[PDB]
Amino acid sequence: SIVTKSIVNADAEARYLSPGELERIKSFVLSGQRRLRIAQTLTENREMIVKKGGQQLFQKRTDVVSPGGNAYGEEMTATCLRDLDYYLRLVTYGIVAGDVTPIEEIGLVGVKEMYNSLGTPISGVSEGVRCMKDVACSLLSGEDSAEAGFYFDYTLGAMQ
Amino acid sequence: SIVTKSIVNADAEARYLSPGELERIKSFVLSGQRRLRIAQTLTENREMIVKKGGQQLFQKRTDVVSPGGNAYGEEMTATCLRDLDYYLRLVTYGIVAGDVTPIEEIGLVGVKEMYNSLGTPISGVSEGVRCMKDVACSLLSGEDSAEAGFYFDYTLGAMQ
Amino acid sequence: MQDAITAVINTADVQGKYLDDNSLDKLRGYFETGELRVRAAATIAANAATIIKESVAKALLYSDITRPGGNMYTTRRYAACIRDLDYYLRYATYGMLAGDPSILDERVLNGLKETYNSLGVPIGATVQAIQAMKEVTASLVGTNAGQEMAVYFDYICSGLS
Amino acid sequence: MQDAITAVINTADVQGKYLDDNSLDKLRGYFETGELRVRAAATIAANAATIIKESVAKALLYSDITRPGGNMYTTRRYAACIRDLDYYLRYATYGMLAGDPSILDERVLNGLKETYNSLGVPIGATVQAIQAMKEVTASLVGTNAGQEMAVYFDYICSGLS
Amino acid sequence: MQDAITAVINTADVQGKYLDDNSLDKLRGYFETGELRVRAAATIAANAATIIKESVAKALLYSDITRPGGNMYTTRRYAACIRDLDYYLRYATYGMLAGDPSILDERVLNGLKETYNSLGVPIGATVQAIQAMKEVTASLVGTNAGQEMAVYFDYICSGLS
Amino acid sequence: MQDAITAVINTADVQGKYLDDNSLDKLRGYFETGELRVRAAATIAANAATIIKESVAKALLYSDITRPGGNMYTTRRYAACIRDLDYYLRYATYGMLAGDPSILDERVLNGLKETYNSLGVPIGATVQAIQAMKEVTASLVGTNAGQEMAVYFDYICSGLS
Amino acid sequence: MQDAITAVINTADVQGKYLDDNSLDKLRGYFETGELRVRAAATIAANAATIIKESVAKALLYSDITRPGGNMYTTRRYAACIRDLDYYLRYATYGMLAGDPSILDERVLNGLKETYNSLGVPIGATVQAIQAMKEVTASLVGTNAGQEMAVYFDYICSGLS
Amino acid sequence: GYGAYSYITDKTKGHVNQYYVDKFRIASDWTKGTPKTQADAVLGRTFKGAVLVPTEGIPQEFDPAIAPRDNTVDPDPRIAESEGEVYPWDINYFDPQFLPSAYSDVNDPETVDSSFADFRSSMWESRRESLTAQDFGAVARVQRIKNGLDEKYLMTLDGMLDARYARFQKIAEPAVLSPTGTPMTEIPGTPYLGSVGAMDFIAQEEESVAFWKSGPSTTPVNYKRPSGAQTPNLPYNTAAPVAAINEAQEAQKGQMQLS
Amino acid sequence: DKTKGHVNQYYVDKFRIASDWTKGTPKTQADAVLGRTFKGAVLVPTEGIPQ
Amino acid sequence: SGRPTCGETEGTEFVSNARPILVDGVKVVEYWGVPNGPVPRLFGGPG
Amino acid sequence: RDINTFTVGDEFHNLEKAFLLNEITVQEVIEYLGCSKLYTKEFYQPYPNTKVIELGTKHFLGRAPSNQAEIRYYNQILASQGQVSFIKTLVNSIEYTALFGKNIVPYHRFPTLPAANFPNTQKLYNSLLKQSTQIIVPSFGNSVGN
Numbered sequence A, B: 001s002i003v004t005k006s007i008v009n010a011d012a013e014a015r016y017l018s019p020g021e022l023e024r025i026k027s028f029v030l031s032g033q034r035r036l037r038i039a040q041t042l043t044e045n046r047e048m049i050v051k052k053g054g055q056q057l058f059q060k061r062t063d064v065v066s067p068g069g070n071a072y073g074e075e076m077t078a079t080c081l082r083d084l085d086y087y088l089r090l091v092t093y094g095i096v097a098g099d100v101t102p103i104e105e106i107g108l109v110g111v112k113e114m115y116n117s118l119g120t121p122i123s124g125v126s127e128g129v130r131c132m133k134d135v136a137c138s139l140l141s142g143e144d145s146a147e148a149g150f151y152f153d154y155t156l157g158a159m160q
Numbered sequence C, D, E, F, G: 001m002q003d004a005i006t007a008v009i010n011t012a013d014v015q016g017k018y019l020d021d022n023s024l025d026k027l028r029g030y031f032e033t034g035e036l037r038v039r040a041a042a043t044i045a046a047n048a049a050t051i052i053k054e055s056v057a058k059a060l061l062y063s064d065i066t067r068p069g070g071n072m073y074t075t076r077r078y079a080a081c082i083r084d085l086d087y088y089l090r091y092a093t094y095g096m097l098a099g100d101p102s103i104l105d106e107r108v109l110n111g112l113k114e115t116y117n118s119l120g121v122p123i124g125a126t127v128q129a130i131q132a133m134k135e136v137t138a139s140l141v142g143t144n145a146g147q148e149m150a151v152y153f154d155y156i157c158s159g160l161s
Numbered sequence H: 001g002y003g004a005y006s007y008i009t010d011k012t013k014g015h016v017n018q019y020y021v022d023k024f025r026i027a028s029d030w031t032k033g034t035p036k037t038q039a040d041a042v043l044g045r046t047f048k049g050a051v052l053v054p055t056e057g058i059p060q061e062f063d064p065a066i067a068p069r070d071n072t073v074d075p076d077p078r079i080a081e082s083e084g085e086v087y088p089w090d091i092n093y094f095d096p097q098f099l100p101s102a103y104s105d106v107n108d109p110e111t112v113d114s115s116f117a118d119f120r121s122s123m124w125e126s127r128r129e130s131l132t133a134q135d136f137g138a139v140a141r142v143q144r145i146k147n148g149l150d151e152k153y154l155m156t157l158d159g160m161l162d163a164r165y166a167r168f169q170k171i172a173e174p175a176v177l178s179p180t181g182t183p184m185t186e187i188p189g190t191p192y193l194g195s196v197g198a199m200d201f202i203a204q205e206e207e208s209v210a211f212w213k214s215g216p217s218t219t220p221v222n223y224k225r226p227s228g229a230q231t232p233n234l235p236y237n238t239a240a241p242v243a244a245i246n247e248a249q250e251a252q253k254g255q256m257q258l259s
Numbered sequence I: 001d002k003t004k005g006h007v008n009q010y011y012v013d014k015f016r017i018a019s020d021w022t023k024g025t026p027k028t029q030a031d032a033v034l035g036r037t038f039k040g041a042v043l044v045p046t047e048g049i050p051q
Numbered sequence J: 001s002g003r004p005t006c007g008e009t010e011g012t013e014f015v016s017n018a019r020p021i022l023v024d025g026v027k028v029v030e031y032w033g034v035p036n037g038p039v040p041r042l043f044g045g046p047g
Numbered sequence K: 001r002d003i004n005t006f007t008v009g010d011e012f013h014n015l016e017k018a019f020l021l022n023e024i025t026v027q028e029v030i031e032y033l034g035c036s037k038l039y040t041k042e043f044y045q046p047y048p049n050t051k052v053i054e055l056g057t058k059h060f061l062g063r064a065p066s067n068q069a070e071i072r073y074y075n076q077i078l079a080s081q082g083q084v085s086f087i088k089t090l091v092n093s094i095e096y097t098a099l100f101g102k103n104i105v106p107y108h109r110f111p112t113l114p115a116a117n118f119p120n121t122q123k124l125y126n127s128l129l130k131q132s133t134q135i136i137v138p139s140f141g142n143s144v145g146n
């Protein structure tokens, strides 16, 4: 969160929170309701984002569903959509947090080691999350999908 | 032991044993019975090596034998040959180990400080081990006494 | 560490659920109290030196501690206690402004009782000093924010004791 | 640490004796089993990744642990878990190839139970993961070498339990 | 640490008193004995190697420790043994020349009994070695200075036992 | 336990020697101070009640401790505190009259700091109460015997702290 | 506890299987060695007193321990010492006759190292006393049964060390 | 107890729990698994689907003149195939690579000779380097002890035993503090002097790395060179410093080499 | 640790002089005089040519 | 680019997406010692 | 301790010649001592990786591990490569350069600011060599959150 980050940064320098830092927390806590609506919309539209994003993923990338592929079968495809559901939930956490700290610590720290331990191509993961970014930007406003879409952009930048 | 000289190595590199190292282990465990022949011969001929090496030591180096010398006296002379027996036994451990770790940790780690704390000239110790090297090379074959004699050479290089 | 927001995402995350209306009520509670926390942190940042001076003057001076043989008797140890008090005030402000005392668990109260029982710092006098900072601080920030700072100072005092 | 050879020189040394026929029989035993151990360590060196992948797939996946709430839920904890498994495989190979589990006493089992009971790592699941590595590894190296590897995996499991 | 002077300043300081006639009598005592302590430390500095050699020859000579399985049996353990006698002689000289055994409390006797009971070092043989250093050292420095060294070697012997 | 006599027989016994002139000088010292110890113990036996009342009246009453929420707030806790004071005074008298604080090691200070840190008894206030009993007791028995009781009370206060 | 039979039923039971030929071979091994274990326990039962007397005479007497200052100097301590040698002999006989040293894990070696390091019992001397019981006992029961007793006395010595 | 709960023992997935893994409660759903061992089996069945047979019968009696049966012969080839173990898919299959015949046998002489000769290579590298390193180190500490030992080093225990090292081995005499403590001077003006003559100039064999070269091939002849620049500046009319005159004489030294 | 270090007994010590022998004799083959058996006899290799 | 722990080719010395601010933020600061990190004193400024 | 009892002889004699000629800075001495086989045999061999962290920070920085994230950081470094990377990261850290720079031998210090640093270094430096195999700081407590 922004509170946690300000605290941590301040803690490193062993000093009280700076006026500039303090001003941001005011802007954050007053921008609250707008964000709740943003995570409310991505919360209540999750099934279309995960299914439609999964469809654009597998249609763009037939290699994963090819015989001998990681995503082959019904069970494995269900596990693949399960993970896209995870990262959509984490993005909503990052939106209400006003920072990627929740997303980064739940989802991104050590992700490459896990998917390399699973045999999963992580570029396919990033293509899946980019597909959900396109669907989720189709569900939102201009400035709103700018913001939420940039949280998706951070997860894409963590995968690549 | 030779086996240890690999597990410590790739342990500190935090990897599995290297292929090149593995070949040596195979060459070691197949060279075993020849080594046990060598340490069998130096085992069953120890009295000749200690006595005859002590004779060549005291004949080359009349310093210690003489009164006022470190080894002068019946009790003192016996101890001197007791130490030659120690090194000879250690050489045999180093032969069956396939490494001088046994020789180093039982005999060589901190040896200079001990014999300097006893007033013993350590050059006379090295001359004694060289005398036992000449006798032990007289009791073996060509390549055989090359190998065993080189273990003795390691002890000489540690004393000097 | 964690703030109140991170804690909500912890409970909602560890259930596997998304954000339901209860967690959004908790986020609304934090976002209502946000500005109050901000100005309280501003004021404490402003008058930390004054607060320390008044709480040491109330709680510690002219006693056996600053008399010789007490633990504050030298200039090095006077400085140490004064410096120590500053840390309690600073991390109590962090705990206030996060809305979650996890910071005091991580960076303050860990090993502190073993430290003071190792050195010979009196725990009693320290607790009295912290409560003096609680009263002065509550007098500066007012009623509401003084209750909030009161829970974190009392958290540190419950940690030492 | 010590191998079987070092252990023989420990007993023969600590008696003061030289090498008698019993100790030479023990070294003949080790030198007979040497090649088998070498090729087993070669195979495990080849397929470490697939051992850990298949053993995690058997023992830990699609359970409460990797579901949220579980110890392995975050990506940080998943990676630490498979890291830990790698250590168990690596040092179990060292213990096999030395012929003496003293390495596991020195560098693995020391303080590990206090560490996992400190952090919150479930010992049960760890042991079941190690036994999954035992079955997969025995499937790779075969019957005899699988008995050797099994003894050392069972040594670590006896250590944590 | 502290010498006799520092200890006087500690007691007088920690009562808040000035230096009264008693403390000045203690400082007079130390300043009378100072030169004797200096020449004693000079002679021990000169003959340290021979003190350790003669004391090992008295105390550990003709003993089972030398024989296989004893604790001095290897070259590494012999060197560690005579190394520890070097520590005892040297810190005993520091304690003599300070006039206060606080050095021995801080840097020698702390954790040493736990160390030797951990390693397997015989305490009895160690104490007899230290007493052999006490007899040889008293023979070198004479009667007075041998009494002074005698209180510090006896302090180390009382510490280990 | 042990008195000064038993301690002399301990040192003389553990050396294996009999009684030399130094140990007889120590026995003469104890037998000189004997009657002083006896009448001091008589007077403390006489005025225990008043020592406790005066020391609680100096050290503890009209403060946060007897105000609600302090540790002496309920009657049960008032009586337990005076009770504790009675034990400190009684065992301090035993320690005085033996001439050796071993009793306070065996029967008082064993586990007492774990007790008070378990219950929540303030150690500070307890030490202040014991020092109040030290001053009052020294005022009753006089200068010499007040120094002797001073040692035992300071021994218990050094034990708690 | 468990004997060899119970251990066989533990492995066969915990696999869920019945008794296969391997487990029956293990029970045949134990039932072959049974009579030898019986007569060995009979002989040790006969001459317990003389085992402890001869082993104390070899290992502990006329040394620093029974001299003043040594661990066994007072009669109370002498009797406690030989009492403990009686426990080591008794439970070593139970361990021999069960064929499984789990008894020594449950009722002897648990907390014993903490107990002797608490009291001041030297572990070195204890181990040497137990090995003296091993040599005397092996002299009474003979070669084979002395090897069996040897593994259990060495088990206790490995436990304390 | 006779039943004890070892975590080593509990294979069943109680601790790490998956709903899907389960006991075979009903006949329906064998589909999901088959038995792998003989102990896991149907009451009258075998690990494979077959009726259990006790495999004990009456051997045809033979004449006493007929030789008796041998226990260690290769089992008949037909027997193995009827159990089915020859096919790779079958569980019990034994790989041909895991045979003991696939090994180099240790008892054979030619493998021992050839493989000892394989052993010696990887060791003469590291053994050579270790020995040479010992020799370089030897030269190094002998020259270090010869150059002199400073006061602070001589106070340390290591220095004390290095001074003894030099004494017992006749390398040099090293000045050490006198049994009184005041430093052993030859001339009472300056501390720590030593006798200088005729043994400083004899070269010792322990200083030289190279034992092999023993013959100097020239004769040296000395003369005086004019020295040009490098002639040190000297103060006029005063006593020059000792160092300056030494530099003046070091500048004016010429060497001829006659082969 | 067979050697007596922890239990400090002066009387039990290793043989260092010719006079010592009266007090004790060797019990095992490994504890032996150079050229002797554990009993007092000259060592014989016990290997010969079978007829 | 060092040795990878688990999986293949990844598992190097820094875990991917780990924090520099968690390690670098927490500094070890001997007050009355050499200043490792910036250290404030409320009462440092001269009277 | 002194180098004499755990070494045969000269070992790395080169550093003595190379350091007395002042070509080699004190840091490079500390690195080449930290990366040798001798340092493996003493401190990396008989101790687990957590204890190797703790000893390594004690030797090369003069303090205890400060938080949990340094323990994970140092574990991954140790596991990923080995001791050589680990000593190179301890020496080449911002901290070691700020405190010691090029020309200062590391010394025992009493850290004040974070968590249990003062107490844990007091547990470390009050322990002798081989006084116990038991680890002083295995880890820190269960912190809520991630």
Ligand SMILES: C=CC1=C(C)[C@@H](Cc2[nH]c(/C=C3N=C(/C=C4\NC(=O)[C@H](C)[C@H]4CC)C(C)=C\3CCC(=O)O)c(CCC(=O)O)c2C)NC1=O
Pocket (backbone or CB within 6 Å): H225, H226, H227, H228, H229
């Ligand atoms: C600072 C002042 C200064 C000098 C004045 C010179 C003087 C000088 N000349 C030579 C050396 C020499 N000088 C000459 C010169 C001669 N050849 C002849 O036919 C003539 C007789 C003569 C010139 C007129 C020769 C030939 C040599 C070499 C001699 C030889 O090697 O045989 C050397 C010996 C070193 C060398 O080989 O260079 C020196 C010191 N050097 C100095 O540093």
Ligand SMILES: CCC1=C(C)/C(=C/C2=NC(=C\c3[nH]c(/C=C4\NC(=O)[C@H](C)[C@H]4CC)c(C)c3CCC(=O)O)/C(CCC(=O)O)=C2C)NC1=O
Pocket (backbone or CB within 6 Å): A064, A070, A071, A076, A079, A080, A081, A083, A084, A086, A087, A090, A106, A107, A118, A120, A121, A123, A124, A125, A128, D061, D062, D063, D066, D067, D072, D073, D074, D075, D078
């Ligand atoms: C909250 C953060 C978080 C994430 C993201 C996470 C992922 C995760 N993905 C897994 C498997 C998997 N994940 C995938 C994913 C994919 N396959 C493809 O080809 C595509 C590129 C991609 C889908 C878009 C597949 C196929 C598996 C199973 C592979 C196998 O088991 O063989 C597993 C193995 C066991 C289990 O799922 O229960 C975990 C733990 N865990 C976490 O804690």
Ligand SMILES: CCC1=C(C)/C(=C/C2=NC(=C\c3[nH]c(/C=C4\NC(=O)[C@H](C)[C@H]4CC)c(C)c3CCC(=O)O)/C(CCC(=O)O)=C2C)NC1=O
Pocket (backbone or CB within 6 Å): D060, D065, D071, D072, D076, D077, D078, D080, D081, D082, D084, D085, D087, D088, D107, D108, D112, D115, D119, D121, D125, D126, D129, K048, K049, K050, K071, K072, K073, K075, K139
């Ligand atoms: C060889 C010497 C050695 C070992 C073995 C070792 C283990 C070890 N495991 C750890 C954590 C961990 N270990 C696991 C392990 C598991 N999780 C699961 O669900 C599985 C069942 C199980 C593995 C089979 C997890 C998840 C953590 C991370 C806990 C956390 O910090 O968040 C940590 C804390 C540091 C960190 O990783 O962040 C250590 C130090 N350390 C060593 O130095």
Ligand SMILES: CCC1=C(C)/C(=C/C2=NC(=C\c3[nH]c(/C=C4\NC(=O)[C@H](C)[C@H]4CC)c(C)c3CCC(=O)O)/C(CCC(=O)O)=C2C)NC1=O
Pocket (backbone or CB within 6 Å): B064, B070, B071, B076, B079, B080, B081, B083, B084, B086, B087, B106, B107, B118, B120, B121, B123, B124, B125, B128, E066, E067, E072, E073, E074, E075, E078
């Ligand atoms: C297994 C490794 C190992 C070795 C080698 C070892 C040697 C060793 N040599 C000793 C003495 C000695 N060693 C010698 C040896 C010699 N004198 C000479 O002039 C010759 C050069 C040389 C004989 C070749 C002498 C004279 C003494 C006794 C010196 C004295 O006591 O004054 C002692 C003193 C006490 C005792 O022996 O019991 C030990 C411990 N200890 C070990 O644990």
Ligand SMILES: CCC1=C(C)/C(=C/C2=NC(=C\c3[nH]c(/C=C4\NC(=O)[C@H](C)[C@H]4CC)c(C)c3CCC(=O)O)/C(CCC(=O)O)=C2C)NC1=O
Pocket (backbone or CB within 6 Å): E060, E065, E071, E072, E076, E077, E078, E080, E081, E082, E084, E085, E087, E088, E091, E107, E108, E112, E115, E119, E121, E122, E125, E126, E129, K005, K128, K129, K130
């Ligand atoms: C001044 C501060 C100080 C002291 C005194 C000290 C003692 C000390 N003695 C040690 C070991 C030892 N100490 C001895 C001592 C003895 N062996 C004998 O037989 C003799 C009877 C006896 C000496 C009189 C031996 C043999 C060891 C080595 C044990 C081993 O590691 O193998 C060790 C373990 C480290 C090592 O040497 O390898 C320490 C730390 N350490 C300190 O920092």
Ligand SMILES: CCC1=C(C)/C(=C/C2=NC(=C\c3[nH]c(/C=C4\NC(=O)[C@H](C)[C@H]4CC)c(C)c3CCC(=O)O)/C(CCC(=O)O)=C2C)NC1=O
Pocket (backbone or CB within 6 Å): F061, F062, F063, F066, F067, F072, F073, F074, F075
């Ligand atoms: C909740 C249970 C509880 C009780 C009841 C309680 C009583 C209590 N009564 C006190 C004093 C006292 N209480 C009295 C009471 C009386 N004087 C009379 O003559 C009357 C009979 C009576 C009033 C009805 C007086 C005079 C004192 C003070 C006496 C003195 O200080 O000299 C004190 C001394 C210090 C202080 O008050 O702060 C306590 C702690 N404490 C407790 O925790």
Ligand SMILES: CCC1=C(C)/C(=C/C2=NC(=C\c3[nH]c(/C=C4\NC(=O)[C@H](C)[C@H]4CC)c(C)c3CCC(=O)O)/C(CCC(=O)O)=C2C)NC1=O
Pocket (backbone or CB within 6 Å): G057, G061, G062, G063, G066, G067, G072, G073, G074, G075, G078
């Ligand atoms: C301070 C209290 C105390 C006492 C008394 C004590 C006695 C004691 N007496 C012993 C032996 C002995 N004590 C005796 C005594 C006697 N034999 C007779 O026939 C007579 C009746 C009697 C002499 C008057 C004998 C013969 C032995 C040795 C028996 C043997 O070793 O076989 C031993 C065995 C080892 C050793 O002496 O060092 C101890 C410890 N220990 C103590 O700590």
